Design a protein around this ligand. Structure first.
Ligand code: GRO
Ligand code: CA
Lengths: 206, 557
């Protein structure tokens, strides 16, 4: 049956979802997630979107401002908008499934509402695809692939040039923050191949 | 994060083996989520962070995949040019272009709401730091506009059945991430995925560039340029956030280097030590690397050279002989609080003093502070992540290697004094410090072990559970937040694949309103502690025979 979603959990509680089409499959994942980690996911949504202060107060105003200054919601929204229906079905299904459990939670909170919600003084609301996307954006892209210290680096170089002079300053920057080191242990062996490019280590953009 | 993939030429009782330990820090409930999907073209089992649609760690019975952060430099900063007369505009290619901007309002519990504006240019969102009437800085990511494509790529890769299909997906993942591959036939592979800028000639990517136009990226580099290897001669693929490939450049972070001193060598030796490894021996590499002091191998030879000619009764010499007898594998004493050997503390104190005396002294205040950490610093709760060799230490290593370093020592970190003198004096400091805290009988020194904490606040510092939900583990272990292993074509099992993982504290974070914790709220916590693991099921048959519960939903979209 194309409307059927089967959920089986193993001896550790790990869920297995069985479904015919994309939307039902991810609905199923979304359902079990909202069962297992609702508070964690609610607080993760709030973290990735900068809405923590709404529920935790003024100690998180700067946190919230910082999160929002580091992304552009509209661009994330437009990416979702360009998705094929099959790819859209992954985000919509997931969100829809969470919504199904969330609705049973708020219908019968006396027994299904995670205790933390009571402790922290609020209730869970429904999710949209944008929300699922930002979980990933906020905890994978911004946490692990958004790294730079270029402003600081320029300031070190500046200070080194002042202490040691222009040429020696530069040479010392190349000693502390080399572009490449030929002795670095590599995951790919030298016999297999090497990186075709170069790169300038003398600040030629100034 | 670490990962070792073992191929057919090195796998014993199997054709391939994959052991992954991503290091995201430790949290309660668990950072990753276990899930299996069966239908709509997927057939998978594994666990994934924050339950993303796509499993970062898992297999489909045909191939297996894993990840480690890549730390390539995929981010640059453009210094935009502003003017007081055109507030909200910036000069780009001879024209004043209006910035993108939006209004935001932070609602606050039991506080007043605050409104603020966010600004963006063609190069990226503006940094709220380093701001002047003339200049503002924009953060440019090569992955900009491809966030959602990277999520989908990580989902569609789960459907691949060979190297070709899998690289097609790897090509669509734009973040800087190392992806790994293995399959039933014994093939293995690695790809340093991600979008990287094709910079103008002369662009030093460790430093900002003007935003006026001439320094704009030409585009992005093609996938052909992404480092990759399929079935290496070596018969294995090992990574611990080290460099992908010869002459490949690292992140521009001042605190991040790929040099002679790299923790990945520790994995390399254990894999090269024996010609073939079974699955159990591949798993034990976690325990061994978890406990391995990472500085001993790097500086023992220097320490030995400096003390080789001292008399037997010189305490500096005794401290070195102590390290010489040690394998560097830390173990708890029966008290559950101290380490059996004082080697790390010796190293920590010696290294700290060496850096103060060398790298730190050569660098202008207060940048000097960036090179002072020994890499052992922590809190009563323990490290928030992995343990690594510190920037300072890596720089010191190039210096104590002398002529064996390909890095020119523009300035002598030892400032004219012989190295031995400096090494010795650092050992003098170490003996004074340690002998006053522990007394003069090294053999009874009981130094504090590091502990491990599963925090109730997530990485952002935000509560994701109540404070009392925090869990503690006596022994800190330099290992993945989770560990998973996939073994292909095992000779002693009837299935063409076996998999295992551990998701502590448990699969579930649920607590009912009356405070009743879920059946699987804490059942993997002790298993994590003792380097144990539970089976991951894939086939309908395996799943049915280990079922504990079942629910069938009927819905139409
Ligand atoms: C924890 C982090 C790392 O290896 O730096 C990471 C990011 C993405 C995938 C795996 C690990
Ligand atoms: Ca850069």
């Amino acid at each position: 049956s194309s409307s059927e979603i089967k959920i089986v959990r193993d001896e550790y509680g790990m869920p297995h979802i069985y479904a015919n089409d994309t939307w039902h499959l991810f609905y199923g994942y979304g359902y079990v997630v909202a069962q297992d980690r609702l508070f964690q996911m609610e607080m993760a949504r709030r973290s990735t979107q900068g809405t923590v202060a709404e529920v935790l107060g003024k100690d998180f105003v700067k946190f919230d401002k910082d999160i929002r200054r580091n992304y552009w919601p509209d661009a994330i929204r437009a990416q979702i908008a360009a998705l094929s229906p099959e790819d859209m079905s992954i985000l919509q299904g997931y969100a829809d499934g969470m919504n199904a459990w969330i609705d049973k939670v708020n219908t019968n909170p006396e027994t299904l509402l995670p205790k933390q919600f009571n402790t922290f003084g609020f209730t869970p609301k429904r999710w949209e695809p944008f929300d699922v996307a930002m979980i990933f954006v906020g905890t994978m892209a911004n946490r692990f692939s958004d790294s730079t210290s270029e402003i600081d680096n320029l300031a070190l170089l500046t200070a080194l040039k002042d202490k040691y002079g222009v040429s020696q300053g530069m040479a010392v920057f190349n000693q502390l923050k080399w572009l490449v080191n030929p002795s670095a242990p590599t995951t790919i062996a030298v016999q297999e191949s090497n990186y075709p490019l170069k790169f300038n280590q003398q600040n030629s953009q100034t | 994060s670490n990962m070792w993939v073992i191929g057919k030429s090195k796998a014993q009782d199997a054709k391939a083996i994959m052991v992954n330990g991503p290091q995201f820090g430790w949290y309660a409930p668990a950072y990753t989520y276990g899930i299996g999907l069966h239908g709509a073209g997927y057939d998978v089992t594994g666990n994934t962070p924050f339950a993303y649609p796509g499993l970062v760690f898992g297999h489909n019975g045909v191939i297996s995949w894993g990840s480690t952060a890549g730390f390539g430099d995929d981010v640059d900063i453009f210094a935009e040019r502003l003017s007081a007369e055109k507030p909200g505009y910036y000069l780009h290619n001879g024209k004043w272009v209006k910035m993108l901007s939006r209004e935001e309002t932070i609602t606050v519990k039991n506080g007043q709401a605050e409104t603020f504006t966010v600004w963006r240019t063609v190069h990226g969102n503006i940094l709220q730091t380093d701001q002047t009437t003339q200049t503002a800085y924009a953060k440019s990511r090569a992955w900009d506009g491809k966030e959602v494509a990277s999520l989908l790529a990580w989902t569609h890769q789960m459907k691949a059945k060979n190297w070709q299909e899998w690289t097609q997906q790897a090509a669509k993942q734009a973040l800087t991430i190392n992806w790994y591959y293995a399959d039933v036939n014994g093939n293995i592979g690695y790809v340093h995925t991600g979008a990287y800028p094709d910079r103008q000639s002369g662009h030093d990517p460790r430093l900002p560039v003007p935003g006026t136009g001439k320094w704009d990226w030409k585009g992005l580099l093609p996938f052909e340029m992404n480092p990759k290897v399929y079935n290496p001669q070596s018969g294995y693929i090992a990574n611990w956030n080290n460099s992908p490939q010869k002459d490949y450049p690292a992140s521009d972070l001042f605190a991040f280097l790929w040099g002679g001193a790299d923790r990945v060598t520790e994995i390399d030796r254990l894999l090269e030590q024996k010609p073939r490894l079974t699955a159990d021996q591949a798993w034990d590499v976690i325990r061994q690397t978890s406990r391995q002091d990472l500085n001993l191998r790097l500086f023992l030879p220097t320490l030995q050279a400096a003390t080789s000619g001292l008399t037997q009764s010189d305490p500096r010499r005794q401290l070195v002989e102590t390290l010489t007898r040690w394998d560097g594998i830390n173990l708890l004493n029966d008290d559950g609080k101290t380490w059996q050997q004082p080697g790390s503390a010796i190293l920590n104190v010696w290294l700290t003093s060496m850096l103060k005396r060398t790298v730190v002294a050569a660098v202008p205040m207060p940048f000097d502070k960036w090179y002072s950490a020994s890499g052992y610093e922590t809190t009563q709760d323990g490290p928030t992540g992995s343990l690594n060799i510190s920037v300072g230490a890596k720089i010191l290593y190039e210096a104590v290697q002398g002529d064996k370093s390909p890095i020119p020592q523009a300035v002598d970190l030892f400032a004219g004094k012989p190295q031995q003198e400096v090494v010795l004096a650092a050992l003098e400091d170490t003996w004074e410090t340690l002998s006053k805290r522990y007394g003069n009988n090294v053999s009874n020194w009981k130094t504090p072990a590091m502990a491990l904490t599963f925090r109730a606040n997530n990485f952002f510092g935000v509560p994701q559970a109540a404070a009392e939900e925090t869990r503690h583990q006596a022994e800190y272990q330099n290992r993945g937040t989770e560990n998973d292993m996939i073994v292909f074509s095992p000779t002693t099992s009837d299935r063409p694949v076996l998999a295992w993982d551990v998701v502590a504290p448990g699969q579930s974070g649920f607590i009912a309103p009356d405070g009743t914790v879920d059946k699987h709220y804490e059942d993997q916590l002790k298993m994590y502690e003792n380097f144990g693991r539970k089976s991951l099921w894939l086939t309908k048959q395996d799943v049915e025979a280990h079922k504990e519960s079942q629910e069938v939903l009927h819905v139409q979209r």
